Design an enzyme around this catalytic site. Structure first.
Site, PDB file in Angstrom:
ATOM      1  N   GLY A  29       0.932  -1.057   0.006  1.00  0.00           N
ATOM      2  CA  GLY A  29      -0.033   0.025   0.132  1.00  0.00           C
ATOM      3  C   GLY A  29       0.847   1.345  -0.097  1.00  0.00           C
ATOM      4  N   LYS A  33       4.754  -2.155   2.974  1.00  0.00           N
ATOM      5  CA  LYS A  33       4.671  -3.627   2.288  1.00  0.00           C
ATOM      6  C   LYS A  33       4.499  -4.497   3.292  1.00  0.00           C
ATOM      7  CE  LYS A  33       7.944  -2.672  -1.579  1.00  0.00           C
ATOM      8  NZ  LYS A  33       7.171  -3.263  -2.676  1.00  0.00           N
ATOM      9  N   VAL A  34       3.761  -5.727   2.830  1.00  0.00           N
ATOM     10  CA  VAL A  34       3.622  -6.892   3.895  1.00  0.00           C
ATOM     11  C   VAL A  34       4.522  -8.156   3.228  1.00  0.00           C
ATOM     12  CG1 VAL A  34       1.918  -8.326   5.137  1.00  0.00           C
ATOM     13  CG2 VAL A  34       1.416  -5.963   4.753  1.00  0.00           C
ATOM     14  N   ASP A 148     -13.889  -0.416  10.387  1.00  0.00           N
ATOM     15  CA  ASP A 148     -13.804  -1.094   8.927  1.00  0.00           C
ATOM     16  C   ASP A 148     -14.093  -2.705   8.822  1.00  0.00           C
ATOM     17  OD1 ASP A 148     -13.430  -1.163   6.067  1.00  0.00           O
ATOM     18  OD2 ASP A 148     -11.319  -0.692   6.286  1.00  0.00           O
ATOM     19  N   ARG A 152     -12.664  -8.705   3.934  1.00  0.00           N
ATOM     20  CA  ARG A 152     -11.262  -8.204   3.507  1.00  0.00           C
ATOM     21  C   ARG A 152     -10.437  -7.807   4.771  1.00  0.00           C
ATOM     22  NH1 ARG A 152     -14.449  -4.047   2.200  1.00  0.00           N
ATOM     23  NH2 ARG A 152     -14.346  -2.123   3.448  1.00  0.00           N
ATOM     24  N   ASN A 153     -11.067  -7.430   5.724  1.00  0.00           N
ATOM     25  CA  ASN A 153     -10.325  -7.198   6.905  1.00  0.00           C
ATOM     26  C   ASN A 153     -10.276  -8.391   8.193  1.00  0.00           C
ATOM     27  OD1 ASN A 153      -9.143  -4.766   6.150  1.00  0.00           O
ATOM     28  ND2 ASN A 153     -10.855  -3.729   6.442  1.00  0.00           N
ATOM     29  N   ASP A 166      -6.092  -7.169  10.183  1.00  0.00           N
ATOM     30  CA  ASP A 166      -5.530  -6.623   8.701  1.00  0.00           C
ATOM     31  C   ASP A 166      -4.035  -5.773   8.714  1.00  0.00           C
ATOM     32  OD1 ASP A 166      -5.773  -3.488   8.429  1.00  0.00           O
ATOM     33  OD2 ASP A 166      -7.348  -4.126   9.730  1.00  0.00           O
TER      34      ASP A 166
END
Ligand SMILES: NC(=O)c1cc(NC(=O)c2cc(-c3cccc(N)n3)ccc2Cl)n(-c2ccccc2)n1
Ligand SMILES: O=c1[nH]cnc2scc(-c3ccc(F)cc3)c12
Length: 290
Positions: A29, A33-34, A148, A152-153, A166
């Site tokens: 993002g 990074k991850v 949120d 996706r989370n 997340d």
């Protein structure tokens, strides 16, 4: 605009850089990074174990102080259905946060890949819902507002284990799930879209939307509509239709999360109690018969 920062305002374990061996990039993002990594001398009897490592691009004083407060709160969050946080590495840039590695990735990706587009059965869908609800009961018990909540989370590990967590990159990876600050409008109740106010009651609403995602195998809520059109449906009081895989019993639960008045929505503890009862004794519902 994270729930972590929202809770911060309203001892952290340190891992040696050399104990972390970066293996692959899992995502990225604007903030960093991850990575998938191997971490030595972290868990007993596991000389080597897989971890997910969040790396922060910015190393400024305010980014460092925000990072520390988030790491303190992450250390405090301890539950079977919350992603495990193992510690930090603040040995210069980039600042690192080390989490357990969830082998099946985010719940949205998992649902879509295990759906009709073999497919998960009713009992498995109820187990996923019940686990997400259990993590939310824990957060509500701490007066923690997620802000949120969406599939996706959530992350999926070994043996259909589902946890809330997340790597702070959903606004980049799933930019289509937000509308412009970037707000997750399809998951939000009318008071949050209108007044930009997030509460445990707005988290309950998003949970009802998560239930809808679960029983549509990860489809986007209001998928036929644009962001401004979806805002209109929600502010006018239009409800998402019952998914085909969704028994009437689960749809009644979603409708309970979606009361227009925040004070009329079910508590998450009650939503969890109902979903737990259905997961252990699933209703005899065949999606084909509707
Ligand atoms: N949109 C953003 O900028 C944004 C949104 C988040 N997530 C949370 O705040 C968040 C994170 C967890 C959690 C818990 C345990 C493990 C684990 N992996 N996650 C639970 C609830 C919440 Cl609500 N971060 C973020 C910032 C820093 C670190 C991770 C994410 N950044
Ligand atoms: O993540 C990737 N995707 C596609 N090709 C490559 S080649 C190398 C990587 C890689 C290996 C280790 C890392 F820490 C980060 C990246 C990689």
């Amino acid at each position: 605009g994270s729930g972590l920062q929202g809770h911060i305002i309203e001892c952290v374990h340190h891992i040696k850089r050399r104990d972390i061996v970066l293996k692959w990039e899992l995502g990225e993002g604007a903030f960093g990074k991850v990575f998938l990594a191997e971490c030595h001398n972290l868990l007993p009897e596991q000389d080597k174990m897989l971890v997910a490592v969040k790396a922060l691009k910015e190393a400024s004083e305010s980014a460092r102080q925000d990072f520390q407060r988030e790491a303190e709160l992450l250390t405090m969050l301890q539950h079977q259905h919350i992603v495990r946080f193992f510690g930090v590495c603040t040995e210069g840039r980039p600042l690192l946060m080390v989490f357990e590695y969830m082998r099946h990735g985010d719940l949205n990706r998992f649902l879509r890949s295990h759906g009709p587009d073999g497919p998960l059965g009713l009992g498995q869908l109820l187990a996923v819902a019940s686990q997400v609800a259990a993590g939310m009961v824990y957060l509500a018990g701490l007066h923690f507002v997620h802000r949120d909540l969406a599939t996706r989370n959530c992350l999926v590990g070994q043996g259909l284990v589902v946890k809330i967590g997340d790597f702070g990159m959903s606004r980049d990876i799933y930019s289509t799930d937000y509308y412009r600050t970037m707000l997750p409008i399809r998951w939000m109740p009318p008071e949050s879209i209108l007044y930009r106010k997030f509460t445990t009651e707005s988290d309950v609403w998003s949970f009802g939307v998560v239930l809808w995602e679960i029983f549509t195998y990860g489809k986007q809520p209001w998928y036929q509509l644009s962001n401004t059109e979806a805002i209109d449906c929600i502010t006018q009081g239009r409800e998402l239709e019952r998914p085909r895989a969704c028994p009437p019993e689960v749809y009644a639960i979603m409708r309970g999360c979606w009361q227009r008045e925040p004070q009329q929505r079910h508590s998450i503890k009650d939503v969890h109690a109902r979903l737990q009862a259905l997961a252990q004794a699933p209703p005899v519902y065949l999606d084909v018969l509707g």
